[PDB]
Design a protein around this nucleic acid. Sequence first.
DNA 1: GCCCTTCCGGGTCCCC
DNA 2: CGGGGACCCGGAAGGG
Lengths: 103, 106
Amino acid sequence: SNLKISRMDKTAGSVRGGDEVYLLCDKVQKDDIEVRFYEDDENGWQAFGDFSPTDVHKQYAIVFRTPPYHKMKIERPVTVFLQLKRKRGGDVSDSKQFTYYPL
Amino acid sequence: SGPIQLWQFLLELLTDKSCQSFISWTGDGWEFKLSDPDEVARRWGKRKNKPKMNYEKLSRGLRYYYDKNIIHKTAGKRYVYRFVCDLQSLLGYTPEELHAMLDVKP
DNA sequence: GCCCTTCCGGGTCCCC
DNA sequence: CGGGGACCCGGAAGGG
């Protein structure tokens, strides 16, 4: 049923992507789960955490890699959101913060 | 934006100061050098779950980019390759600007 | 189809 | 000189 991010390993990363995040969550199916990063402007940026079905641990955790931001040129730390999302299902989770850094 | 691609992985490395010892910008637009190729291939291998990854094979990844407007070789220069694709749109900066932030001694 | 990964046969260097 | 051993080049097969 409903999707919950219980807690996360970390809530900040480099704008360049690649940061490894341990997300703890309620029951998920390895083959019907996606981690969507987003920004809710008219710009409407989205991206997906990079992981595989084997990185999904006993139905209750995901180990994944952050995607890049849409740009590296920022001089004050930016904040985007993220949610769990079923590929087939539409339904998503309560969306946690994530924060991108320069350099 | 799923499984990261080779060109994308190298770009990630290129923007980390803590990786400059084994991969770095030459200081000429988007030209870059794998100063320690064994290391670079070891990390690419790690990210993609391929223990037996080496530069010989990673290089074949790079050669499939040659007709695809992503990356070219710089003829004659050992381990030197050039991004031909639109990096200024991807990462906000020009090459000169990026080189400044990352202390690139050309 | 895509994007490599794994091979390979062939080419040019340089160095022992 | 003759060989190995690096980089390189792309074709072919195959996986996920």
